[PDB]
Chains A and B, each alone.
With several copies, the nearest count.
Chain A
Amino acid sequence: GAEEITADIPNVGEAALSKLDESGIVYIGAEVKGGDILVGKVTPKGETQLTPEEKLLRAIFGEKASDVKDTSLRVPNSVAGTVIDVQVFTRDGVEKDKR
């Protein structure tokens, strides 16, 4: 399918989404450190085989949300700075997000 730039990043809490806007792009002027999410992107993934131990673990606790995988842009390690400019390039024929 088509990869989407959205803030709905699986297995990530609202602590890491504070600097992100509704469209999933970091604000301008945000103090970001290593490992912080700048742009939130989710990639579609196919069916993945689960080991029998993992199947039992899912049987006990029913949590399972793995429709998409987290492939998002993150600040490189040992790099700390401020976001001073963000530029979005969209292909002709693709809907423009709010940002």
Chain B
Amino acid sequence: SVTEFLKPRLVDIEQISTTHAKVTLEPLERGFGHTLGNALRRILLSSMPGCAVTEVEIEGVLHEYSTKEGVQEDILEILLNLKGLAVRVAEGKDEVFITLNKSGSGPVVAGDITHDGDVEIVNPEHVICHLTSDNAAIAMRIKVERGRGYVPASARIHERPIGRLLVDATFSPVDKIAYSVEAARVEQRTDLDKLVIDMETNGTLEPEEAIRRAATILAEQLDAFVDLRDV
């Protein structure tokens, strides 16, 4: 009828790659596709929780603006590379420590990090540094924290030992969101639409799960309007 609408359902999920996916919502009434797509894009791009590197500790290193023998990259470049690490932490833990020791010439990559089985590395081929000598060795202790949004090192409220290096953390796993509203063939009606959301992420967050968190956030914010009263 006119009063009653049709509620969309998640009808298709497509995983083109580890960092790329498409989610299909169907059916939608006239004009609701754009509304839901824009709302979900704004929520997904702003308020998705994730895990990021926050603190690093390298043996023999006192500050970022320094050098280590047998390493082609400075500590600043190593920290910038560590900023791009994709880590999934098992639920219930908001803080974890991983460890990276490597000796010998070659590219030190993310697949050489030793974890406790509750941490998953989504990009094992991510190059972290390069060791240019057979005598060169690297030993690092990395702190991974769960969070939301972007928290720079300066914004963290203030003892911290000399040698602990703060890293700016971008917790949000979502990189790119696109949405398209197309025609849907449901029963005999033509007015029904279909919403396809293209998500490009770091692989940490599942597409369906992210969709549900965005919907939950939107519903919780709408609850204030559903019960409009002077407070």
Asked whether the complex places CB atoms of A and B closer than 8 A, the reply is yes
- Which residues of A pack against B, CB within 8 Å? 18, 27-31, 80, 82-84
Distance of A30 from chain B, by nearest CB (Å): 6
Give the residues from 50 to 78 in chain B that come closer than 8 angstroms, CB to CB, to chain A.
Answer: 62-66
Total number of residue pairs linking A and B with CB closer than 8 Å? 18
Query: 1/0 per residue B131-171: CB within 8 Å of A?
Result: 00000000000000000000000100001101100000000
Q: Which listed residue (B62, B154, B160) contacts A28, Cβ 8 A? A: B62
Distance of B93 from chain A, by nearest CB (Å): 27
Which applies to chain B's interface (DSSP): helix, strand, loop or mixed? loop
Which of A27, A80, A84 has the most B CB atoms < 10 Å from its CB? A84
Distance of B162 from chain A, by nearest CB (Å): 5
- Which residues of B pack against A, CB within 8 Å? 62-66, 154, 159-160, 162-163
Task: Assess whether A84 is in contact with B154, with CB atoms less than 8 Å apart.
Answer: no
Task: Assess whether B65 is in contact with A27, with CB atoms less than 8 Å apart.
Answer: no
**A29-B163 CB under 8 A given contacts A82-B64, A82-B65, A84-B63:** yes
Task: Assess whether B162 is in contact with A18, with CB atoms less than 8 Å apart.
Answer: no
Task: Assess whether B65 is in contact with A84, with CB atoms less than 8 Å apart.
Answer: yes
Q: Which listed residue (B64, B66, B154, B162) contacts A30, Cβ 8 A? A: B162
Distance of A25 from chain B, by nearest CB (Å): 14
Distance of B79 from chain A, by nearest CB (Å): 13
Given contacts A28-B62, A82-B64, A84-B66, could you give 15 more A-B pairs where the C-beta distance is less than 8 Å? A18-B159, A27-B162, A28-B63, A29-B62, A29-B63, A29-B162, A29-B163, A30-B162, A31-B160, A80-B154, A82-B63, A82-B65, A83-B63, A84-B63, A84-B65
Within 8 Å CB of A30, what residues of B? 162
Distance of B57 from chain A, by nearest CB (Å): 12
Within 8 Å CB of A31, what residues of B? 160
Q: Which residue of B lies closest to A28 (CB)?
A: B62
Within 8 Å CB of A27, what residues of B? 162
